[PDB]
């Protein structure tokens, strides 16, 4: 009655979980990539700031930590 709706979702979810199992290391690769990208855009955002403020180098003792690439 209502289960028809549930059943549908049920199927969808199953099929998707299955797929994540197959596609797993492909997915790993893509997410690691996106994390690198993220870190980079972040660095650019920072660099952009200290440059538009007229400074040449980043301020003394600034290492710009790696937040997204944080070890799992």
């Amino acid at each position: 009655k209502n289960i028809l709706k549930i059943r549908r979702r049920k199927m969808n979810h199953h099929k998707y979980r299955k797929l994540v199992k197959r596609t797993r290391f492909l997915r790993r690769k893509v997410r690691e990539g996106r994390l690198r990208q993220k870190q980079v855009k972040f660095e650019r955002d920072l660099k952009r700031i200290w440059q538009k403020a007229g400074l040449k180098e980043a301020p003394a003792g600034w290492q710009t930590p790696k937040i997204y690439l944080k070890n799992q």
């Binding site: 920072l46 700031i49 403020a53 301020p59 003394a60 710009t64 930590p65 937040i67």
Partner: protein, 175 residues
Amino acid sequence: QDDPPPSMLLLDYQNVPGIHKVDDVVKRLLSLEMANQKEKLKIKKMQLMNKVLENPEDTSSLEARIVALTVKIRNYEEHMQKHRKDKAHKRFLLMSIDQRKKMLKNLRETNYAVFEKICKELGIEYTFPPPYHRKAHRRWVTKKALCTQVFREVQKLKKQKRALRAAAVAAHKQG
């Protein structure tokens, strides 16, 4: 930390006549010695409400409620120091703290003299809520730290450039 002495003769039996004439043993059974913890809280409450307040008779007054709630809060503090993982009492503590503070912000808006006094006496410190509660996360925390360092650099450099300007123009103007 205060110390409502072991021999202190519980709240209800303090004002009954000729108590001090009784022999050591009964005096001892009516002591905070043989007492519960709840009796030490009654005592602590009376004592605080006498040190801090003006009219200890009014239970109704905001100030009175703040004092009482503060006794309860210090008590949950103790309990929580012993039991780290009790989440139920952690709830009581945080909650009851928010109630205290709500009442404080209500004093400050109505009778300020008293509010001032209470904060001094119970050692409570009243902070205004921030505007904008937002979760400070890794990206924002880092970026802000950077922006602050950048700022401090820049204005320091403008200061050095003005020192150079002043020195140059002065040593020029003299000869």
